[PDB]
mmCIF file of C-alpha atoms and ligand atoms in Angstrom:
data_model
loop_
_atom_site.group_PDB
_atom_site.id
_atom_site.type_symbol
_atom_site.label_atom_id
_atom_site.label_comp_id
_atom_site.label_asym_id
_atom_site.label_seq_id
_atom_site.Cartn_x
_atom_site.Cartn_y
_atom_site.Cartn_z
ATOM 1 C CA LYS A 1 140.514 70.934 78.889
ATOM 2 C CA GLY A 2 137.851 72.776 76.791
ATOM 3 C CA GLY A 3 139.290 76.200 76.678
ATOM 4 C CA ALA A 4 137.386 79.049 79.670
ATOM 5 C CA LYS A 5 133.830 79.253 80.299
ATOM 6 C CA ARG A 6 133.541 81.330 76.226
ATOM 7 C CA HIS A 7 130.987 83.734 74.114
ATOM 8 C CA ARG A 8 131.337 82.727 71.140
ATOM 9 C CA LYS A 9 128.830 83.296 67.919
ATOM 10 C CA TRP A 10 127.787 79.831 67.128
ATOM 11 C CA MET B 1 104.370 71.830 66.132
ATOM 12 C CA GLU B 2 102.633 67.993 66.814
ATOM 13 C CA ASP B 3 104.384 66.394 63.871
ATOM 14 C CA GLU B 4 107.638 67.258 65.165
ATOM 15 C CA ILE B 5 107.223 66.907 68.373
ATOM 16 C CA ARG B 6 105.755 63.615 67.406
ATOM 17 C CA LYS B 7 109.101 62.892 65.494
ATOM 18 C CA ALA B 8 111.140 63.928 68.940
ATOM 19 C CA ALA B 9 108.688 61.037 70.449
ATOM 20 C CA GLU B 10 109.751 58.891 68.094
ATOM 21 C CA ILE B 11 113.116 59.383 68.266
ATOM 22 C CA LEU B 12 113.782 59.370 71.983
ATOM 23 C CA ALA B 13 111.341 55.699 72.754
ATOM 24 C CA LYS B 14 112.875 54.169 70.066
ATOM 25 C CA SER B 15 116.523 55.250 72.153
ATOM 26 C CA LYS B 16 119.332 53.580 73.645
ATOM 27 C CA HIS B 17 120.623 55.967 75.253
ATOM 28 C CA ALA B 18 119.085 59.293 74.505
ATOM 29 C CA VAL B 19 120.825 62.291 76.687
ATOM 30 C CA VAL B 20 119.638 65.712 77.749
ATOM 31 C CA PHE B 21 121.354 69.386 77.453
ATOM 32 C CA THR B 22 119.338 71.990 79.114
ATOM 33 C CA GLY B 23 120.360 76.164 79.557
ATOM 34 C CA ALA B 24 119.315 78.794 80.765
ATOM 35 C CA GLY B 25 116.023 79.211 79.074
ATOM 36 C CA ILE B 26 113.720 76.169 80.993
ATOM 37 C CA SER B 27 115.160 78.382 84.306
ATOM 38 C CA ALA B 28 113.550 82.081 83.044
ATOM 39 C CA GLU B 29 110.703 82.501 84.327
ATOM 40 C CA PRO B 30 128.336 90.408 81.825
ATOM 41 C CA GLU B 31 131.720 90.968 82.169
ATOM 42 C CA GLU B 32 131.750 93.193 85.321
ATOM 43 C CA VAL B 33 128.853 89.944 86.286
ATOM 44 C CA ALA B 34 129.716 86.919 85.648
ATOM 45 C CA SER B 35 133.694 86.528 85.028
ATOM 46 C CA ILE B 36 136.873 85.714 87.608
ATOM 47 C CA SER B 37 137.946 89.108 86.807
ATOM 48 C CA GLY B 38 134.827 91.462 87.621
ATOM 49 C CA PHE B 39 134.383 88.790 90.104
ATOM 50 C CA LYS B 40 137.973 89.390 91.250
ATOM 51 C CA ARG B 41 137.936 93.696 90.259
ATOM 52 C CA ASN B 42 134.002 93.389 92.561
ATOM 53 C CA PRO B 43 132.567 90.373 94.100
ATOM 54 C CA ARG B 44 130.111 93.060 95.452
ATOM 55 C CA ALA B 45 128.782 93.128 91.920
ATOM 56 C CA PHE B 46 128.545 89.587 91.533
ATOM 57 C CA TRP B 47 126.799 89.196 94.022
ATOM 58 C CA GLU B 48 124.138 92.211 93.312
ATOM 59 C CA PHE B 49 123.709 90.516 89.869
ATOM 60 C CA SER B 50 122.692 87.490 91.437
ATOM 61 C CA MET B 51 120.288 88.589 93.665
ATOM 62 C CA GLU B 52 118.373 90.698 91.018
ATOM 63 C CA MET B 53 118.806 87.274 88.861
ATOM 64 C CA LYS B 54 116.923 85.479 91.716
ATOM 65 C CA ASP B 55 113.674 87.379 90.979
ATOM 66 C CA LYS B 56 113.743 86.652 87.562
ATOM 67 C CA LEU B 57 114.078 82.048 87.992
ATOM 68 C CA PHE B 58 112.078 79.790 88.763
ATOM 69 C CA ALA B 59 112.008 79.861 92.605
ATOM 70 C CA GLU B 60 110.913 75.856 91.556
ATOM 71 C CA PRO B 61 111.190 73.114 88.809
ATOM 72 C CA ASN B 62 108.365 73.528 86.378
ATOM 73 C CA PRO B 63 107.232 70.705 84.550
ATOM 74 C CA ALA B 64 110.449 70.591 81.552
ATOM 75 C CA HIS B 65 112.087 69.660 85.198
ATOM 76 C CA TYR B 66 109.237 67.022 85.547
ATOM 77 C CA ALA B 67 109.714 65.750 81.964
ATOM 78 C CA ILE B 68 112.655 65.443 81.609
ATOM 79 C CA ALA B 69 112.882 63.870 85.333
ATOM 80 C CA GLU B 70 109.952 61.397 83.821
ATOM 81 C CA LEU B 71 112.309 60.623 81.059
ATOM 82 C CA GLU B 72 115.219 59.611 83.253
ATOM 83 C CA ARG B 73 112.301 57.155 85.799
ATOM 84 C CA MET B 74 110.989 55.005 82.525
ATOM 85 C CA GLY B 75 115.030 54.586 81.523
ATOM 86 C CA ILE B 76 115.356 57.073 78.660
ATOM 87 C CA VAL B 77 117.021 59.397 79.799
ATOM 88 C CA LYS B 78 120.521 58.164 80.696
ATOM 89 C CA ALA B 79 122.037 61.804 81.697
ATOM 90 C CA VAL B 80 121.120 65.890 82.035
ATOM 91 C CA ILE B 81 123.353 67.450 81.149
ATOM 92 C CA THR B 82 123.192 71.020 82.151
ATOM 93 C CA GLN B 83 124.572 74.374 81.933
ATOM 94 C CA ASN B 84 122.938 75.483 84.676
ATOM 95 C CA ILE B 85 123.515 76.223 88.054
ATOM 96 C CA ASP B 86 120.166 76.372 90.193
ATOM 97 C CA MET B 87 119.939 72.921 91.033
ATOM 98 C CA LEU B 88 115.880 72.950 89.529
ATOM 99 C CA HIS B 89 116.203 69.715 87.656
ATOM 100 C CA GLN B 90 118.411 67.216 91.127
ATOM 101 C CA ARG B 91 115.380 69.921 93.142
ATOM 102 C CA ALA B 92 113.012 68.087 90.135
ATOM 103 C CA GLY B 93 113.738 64.392 90.487
ATOM 104 C CA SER B 94 116.967 63.675 88.479
ATOM 105 C CA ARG B 95 119.201 61.913 89.897
ATOM 106 C CA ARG B 96 121.857 61.812 86.612
ATOM 107 C CA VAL B 97 123.299 65.919 87.336
ATOM 108 C CA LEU B 98 125.686 67.193 85.072
ATOM 109 C CA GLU B 99 126.810 70.112 85.896
ATOM 110 C CA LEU B 100 129.387 71.836 83.116
ATOM 111 C CA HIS B 101 128.753 75.190 85.496
ATOM 112 C CA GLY B 102 128.966 74.068 88.793
ATOM 113 C CA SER B 103 126.471 75.644 91.552
ATOM 114 C CA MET B 104 125.807 77.418 94.047
ATOM 115 C CA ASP B 105 125.456 74.413 96.664
ATOM 116 C CA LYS B 106 129.057 75.323 97.662
ATOM 117 C CA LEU B 107 131.333 77.684 98.698
ATOM 118 C CA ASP B 108 134.362 78.937 99.024
ATOM 119 C CA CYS B 109 136.680 82.484 100.785
ATOM 120 C CA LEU B 110 138.727 83.901 98.100
ATOM 121 C CA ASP B 111 141.151 84.766 101.336
ATOM 122 C CA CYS B 112 141.369 82.960 103.448
ATOM 123 C CA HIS B 113 140.058 79.302 101.833
ATOM 124 C CA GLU B 114 136.971 78.653 104.280
ATOM 125 C CA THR B 115 134.262 76.423 102.810
ATOM 126 C CA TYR B 116 130.644 76.571 102.668
ATOM 127 C CA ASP B 117 127.606 75.483 102.350
ATOM 128 C CA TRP B 118 125.011 77.697 100.381
ATOM 129 C CA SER B 119 121.939 77.358 102.517
ATOM 130 C CA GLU B 120 124.903 79.439 105.698
ATOM 131 C CA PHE B 121 124.249 82.673 103.418
ATOM 132 C CA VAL B 122 120.674 82.097 101.337
ATOM 133 C CA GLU B 123 118.306 84.049 104.729
ATOM 134 C CA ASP B 124 120.873 87.146 104.486
ATOM 135 C CA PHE B 125 120.557 86.763 100.822
ATOM 136 C CA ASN B 126 117.438 87.315 99.882
ATOM 137 C CA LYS B 127 117.420 90.018 102.695
ATOM 138 C CA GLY B 128 120.237 92.064 100.058
ATOM 139 C CA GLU B 129 123.055 91.221 102.603
ATOM 140 C CA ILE B 130 126.334 89.753 100.197
ATOM 141 C CA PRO B 131 127.763 87.010 101.659
ATOM 142 C CA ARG B 132 131.016 87.650 103.746
ATOM 143 C CA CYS B 133 133.319 85.255 105.326
ATOM 144 C CA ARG B 134 132.325 85.393 109.027
ATOM 145 C CA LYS B 135 136.536 83.834 109.806
ATOM 146 C CA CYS B 136 137.976 86.842 107.905
ATOM 147 C CA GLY B 137 135.637 89.709 106.740
ATOM 148 C CA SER B 138 137.040 88.822 102.980
ATOM 149 C CA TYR B 139 134.119 90.162 100.323
ATOM 150 C CA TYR B 140 135.610 87.439 98.732
ATOM 151 C CA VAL B 141 133.008 84.329 99.114
ATOM 152 C CA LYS B 142 132.649 82.910 95.995
ATOM 153 C CA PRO B 143 130.323 80.515 94.295
ATOM 154 C CA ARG B 144 131.230 77.275 92.764
ATOM 155 C CA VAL B 145 130.346 78.108 89.248
ATOM 156 C CA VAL B 146 132.064 78.526 86.694
ATOM 157 C CA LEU B 147 131.981 81.927 85.483
ATOM 158 C CA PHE B 148 133.161 83.162 82.889
ATOM 159 C CA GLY B 149 136.810 82.864 81.652
ATOM 160 C CA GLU B 150 136.766 79.896 84.124
ATOM 161 C CA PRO B 151 138.016 76.012 83.169
ATOM 162 C CA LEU B 152 134.726 73.594 83.584
ATOM 163 C CA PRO B 153 135.900 70.906 86.272
ATOM 164 C CA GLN B 154 137.184 68.249 84.167
ATOM 165 C CA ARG B 155 135.647 65.218 85.916
ATOM 166 C CA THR B 156 131.984 67.067 84.984
ATOM 167 C CA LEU B 157 133.899 67.475 81.192
ATOM 168 C CA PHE B 158 134.910 64.177 80.608
ATOM 169 C CA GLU B 159 131.340 62.537 82.023
ATOM 170 C CA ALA B 160 129.379 65.629 79.615
ATOM 171 C CA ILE B 161 131.946 64.293 76.924
ATOM 172 C CA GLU B 162 131.349 60.548 77.069
ATOM 173 C CA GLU B 163 127.863 61.149 76.886
ATOM 174 C CA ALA B 164 127.760 62.544 73.922
ATOM 175 C CA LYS B 165 130.226 60.809 72.282
ATOM 176 C CA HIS B 166 128.383 57.369 73.426
ATOM 177 C CA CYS B 167 124.137 58.128 73.152
ATOM 178 C CA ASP B 168 122.016 58.072 70.186
ATOM 179 C CA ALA B 169 119.912 60.566 70.738
ATOM 180 C CA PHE B 170 120.496 63.642 72.296
ATOM 181 C CA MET B 171 117.921 66.722 72.979
ATOM 182 C CA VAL B 172 119.026 70.787 73.860
ATOM 183 C CA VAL B 173 116.863 72.199 75.890
ATOM 184 C CA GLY B 174 116.614 76.166 76.082
ATOM 185 C CA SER B 175 120.131 77.152 75.189
ATOM 186 C CA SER B 176 121.047 79.352 72.569
ATOM 187 C CA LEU B 177 124.642 77.253 72.312
ATOM 188 C CA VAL B 178 127.088 81.017 72.156
ATOM 189 C CA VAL B 179 128.195 79.251 75.579
ATOM 190 C CA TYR B 180 131.844 76.863 74.549
ATOM 191 C CA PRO B 181 132.957 74.207 75.345
ATOM 192 C CA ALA B 182 129.236 73.480 76.933
ATOM 193 C CA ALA B 183 127.958 74.293 73.082
ATOM 194 C CA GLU B 184 130.721 71.483 71.776
ATOM 195 C CA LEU B 185 128.875 68.771 73.291
ATOM 196 C CA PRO B 186 125.340 69.149 70.871
ATOM 197 C CA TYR B 187 128.172 69.157 68.031
ATOM 198 C CA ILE B 188 130.411 65.761 69.763
ATOM 199 C CA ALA B 189 127.068 63.704 69.927
ATOM 200 C CA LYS B 190 125.955 65.124 65.611
ATOM 201 C CA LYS B 191 129.479 63.729 64.640
ATOM 202 C CA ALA B 192 128.849 60.471 67.138
ATOM 203 C CA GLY B 193 125.535 59.558 64.708
ATOM 204 C CA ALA B 194 123.557 60.355 67.364
ATOM 205 C CA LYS B 195 119.114 61.819 66.216
ATOM 206 C CA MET B 196 118.835 66.060 67.595
ATOM 207 C CA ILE B 197 116.026 67.105 68.977
ATOM 208 C CA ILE B 198 116.472 71.038 69.551
ATOM 209 C CA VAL B 199 113.256 72.997 71.845
ATOM 210 C CA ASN B 200 113.961 76.206 71.994
ATOM 211 C CA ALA B 201 111.579 79.998 72.586
ATOM 212 C CA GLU B 202 113.420 81.415 69.391
ATOM 213 C CA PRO B 203 115.820 80.008 66.274
ATOM 214 C CA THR B 204 119.280 79.734 67.381
ATOM 215 C CA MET B 205 122.428 80.080 64.660
ATOM 216 C CA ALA B 206 123.231 76.070 65.283
ATOM 217 C CA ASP B 207 119.484 74.470 64.169
ATOM 218 C CA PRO B 208 120.923 73.334 60.454
ATOM 219 C CA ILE B 209 122.664 70.373 62.275
ATOM 220 C CA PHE B 210 119.551 69.972 64.347
ATOM 221 C CA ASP B 211 117.472 66.451 63.200
ATOM 222 C CA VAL B 212 113.697 68.121 65.118
ATOM 223 C CA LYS B 213 113.975 71.789 65.891
ATOM 224 C CA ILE B 214 110.525 72.862 68.129
ATOM 225 C CA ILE B 215 109.919 76.898 68.914
ATOM 226 C CA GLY B 216 107.967 76.804 71.880
ATOM 227 C CA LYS B 217 107.618 76.711 75.568
ATOM 228 C CA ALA B 218 109.706 74.057 77.286
ATOM 229 C CA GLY B 219 106.889 73.579 79.991
ATOM 230 C CA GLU B 220 104.692 73.040 77.640
ATOM 231 C CA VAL B 221 106.382 71.296 75.284
ATOM 232 C CA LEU B 222 108.359 69.005 76.776
ATOM 233 C CA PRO B 223 104.690 67.115 79.234
ATOM 234 C CA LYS B 224 103.309 66.985 75.024
ATOM 235 C CA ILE B 225 106.526 64.881 74.187
ATOM 236 C CA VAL B 226 106.743 62.491 77.472
ATOM 237 C CA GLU B 227 102.345 61.678 77.120
ATOM 238 C CA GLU B 228 104.016 60.899 73.647
ATOM 239 C CA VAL B 229 106.306 58.485 74.746
ATOM 240 C CA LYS B 230 104.566 56.894 77.183
ATOM 241 C CA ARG B 231 101.481 56.339 74.332
ATOM 242 C CA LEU B 232 104.249 54.704 71.367
ATOM 243 C CA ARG B 233 105.841 52.618 74.825
ATOM 244 C CA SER B 234 102.189 51.627 74.770
ATOM 245 C CA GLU B 235 102.533 53.254 78.856
ATOM 246 C CA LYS B 236 99.329 55.830 77.773
HETATM 247 ZN ZN1 ZN C 301 137.906 84.049 105.282
#
């Protein structure tokens, strides 16, 4: 389902 | 940036199905503040942070929002996918807006499940009085916004994926493309063969995938793109 709203470098 | 602006305009003027994707860069001018674990530990911190942030955001739509609304009115832009929760796209006249992270419009008390409209809290909020549940007194009034650590609304995400998969032009405006799953969408459009445009104040790590890169203020750039598109269509 797209996983959790999260920060990644790119 | 004029040749890049013209290149973007050419892409949009020729497109059968253009999509616009926006983030905080168009609205402006961490765990404790904006995550679900943070909210559950201290919901007041989220609200105090939001009170500070409101002052840094545009109180009403800017020329970038109106330009994007106009491109929809012209039949070019078929959808706006946004990471923003401020509803500025809709207030500028955009209709087909996919709110990936929800919005402040509706809220719920996590304790007694009472529901609210933002209009019920906004006066108090502007005076620095945090939302409290009137029924049960709880400090846990959560807006229907996707906080960090929460999944996105499934219907909205599906629609956004479908837009990305079946567009021939995809224009990112005011996003650094570091928040997932939202950031997946331009890659989906790229894989699907869409012409890729990015408009930002600064570079992003995703810049290499874009066919057209414009560095500038969205409020200046987007109206210029619209004017050029109109010229190409003999509307100006
Ligand atoms: Zn309650």
